Amino acid sequence: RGSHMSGGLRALAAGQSAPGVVSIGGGTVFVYSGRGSQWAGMGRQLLADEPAFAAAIAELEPEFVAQGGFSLRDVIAGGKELVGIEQIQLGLIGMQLALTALWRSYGVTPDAVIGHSMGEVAAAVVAGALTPAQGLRVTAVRSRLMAPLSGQGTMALLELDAEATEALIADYPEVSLGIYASPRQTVISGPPLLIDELIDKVRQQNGFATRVNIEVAPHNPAMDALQPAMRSELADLTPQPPTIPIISTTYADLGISLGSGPRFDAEHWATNMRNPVRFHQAIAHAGADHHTFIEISAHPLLTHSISDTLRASYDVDNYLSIGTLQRDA
Numbered sequence: 433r434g435s436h437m438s439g440g441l442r443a444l445a446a447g448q449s450a451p452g453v454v455s456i457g458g459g460t461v462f463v464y465s466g467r468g469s470q471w472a473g474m475g476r477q478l479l480a481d482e483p484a485f486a487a488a489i490a491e492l493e494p495e496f497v498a499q500g501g502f503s504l505r506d507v508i509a510g511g512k513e514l515v516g517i518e519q520i521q522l523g524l525i526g527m528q529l530a531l532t533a534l535w536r537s538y539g540v541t542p543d544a545v546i547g548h549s550m551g552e553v554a555a556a557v558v559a560g561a562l563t564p565a566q567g568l569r570v571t572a573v574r575s576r577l578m579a580p581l582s583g584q585g586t587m588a589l590l591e592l593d594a595e596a597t598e599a600l601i602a603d604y605p606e607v608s609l610g611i612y613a614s615p616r617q618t619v620i621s622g623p624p625l626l627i628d629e630l631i632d633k634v635r636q637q638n639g640f641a642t643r644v645n646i647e648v649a650p651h652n653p654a655m656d657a658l659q660p661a662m663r664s665e666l667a668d669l670t671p672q673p674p675t676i677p678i679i680s681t682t683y684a685d686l687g688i689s690l691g692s693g694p695r696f697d698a699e700h701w702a703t704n705m706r707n708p709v710r711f712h713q714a715i716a717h718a719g720a721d722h723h724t725f726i727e728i729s730a731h732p733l734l735t736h737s738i739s740d741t742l743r744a745s746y747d748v749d750n751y752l753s754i755g756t757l758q759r760d761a
């Protein structure tokens with residue numbers, strides 16, 4: 433039935449498509465979003481009808497119980513709301529890894545991964561730079577550090593390019609450019625009263641602007657306060673070089689410069705939560721030679737931005753930008 437599956441996944445789930453199928457060009461990129469997008473009953477039918485999904489949830493559950501005092505298995509089965517930044521972030525990465533297992537069971541695996549904002553932890557796990565246990569650990573530490581800030585920040589998506597956004601916020605020292613979303617959209621981050629003021633200005637100047645469903649201000653100066661504790665608590669984190677190309681959204685150079693490769697260690701995660709998200713540039717880089725982009729999320733929020741980026745550089749008739757699950761049935 434898969435009422436909440438994307439077309440590509442549902443077709444594989446029923447067996448209508450052949451293994452790994454999803455004309456398009458070659459290459460597949462898995463995109464891990466940074467936003468929690470829980471919807472009522474998320475994963476409930478998956479847990480009962482998709483053994484690969486259920487195995488992943490089962491395998492994560494012991495670490496969650498002991499690393500998070502929270503049961504993802506019970507959230508999914510009981511359709512419980514994730515409450516608080518810690519449950520939201522921890523639940524999201526569990527869903528991301530379990531959904532990656534689901535695609536794998538139907539022959540769909542990534543040739544490269546992209547992590548958007550906090551979704552770069554999940555990307556690093558799937559690329560082999562971190563183990564699932566290490567991914568939970570990073571998520572647990574960071575989310576606990578951000579939880580006390582709940583309600584002191586937010587973000588907003590604006591129908592402005594990056595330089596127009598920097599112009600808008602020039603006189604707003606507390607507001608930052610948070611995400612380079614596409615050539616046409618940019619996310620700002622900062623104190624909620626000021627984000628609301630900027631949303632209104634964009635609308636009154638005949639543009640489009642929306643609040644992000646988030647109650648902190650990542651990718652902003654506010655995060656400086658948290659970086660020392662990040663480096664201390666994750667001091668013992670020992671990552672490995674990735675085995676799948678990972679295009680990092682943390683750095684201007686996408687973490688793919690000649691020479692040494694990024695080390696996905698405590699400093700990287702402290703940097704990832706503070707630096708602006710180079711999502712536009714990572715997608716552009718990836719679309720040079722990869723033609724299928726799959727957002728690994730509970731509800732597709734990046735597929736339009738992906739398509740906008742790809743359309744600016746490539747012939748999108750040869751491309752496919754899809755999600756995994758969606759809140760509508």
Ligand code: NA
Pocket residue numbers: 481482483484485534537
């Ligand atoms: Na399965």
Ligand code: NA
Pocket residue numbers: 532533534536
């Ligand atoms: Na897997």
Ligand code: NA
Pocket residue numbers: 563564565566
């Ligand atoms: Na592990």
Ligand code: NA
Pocket residue numbers: 670671672
């Ligand atoms: Na290691």
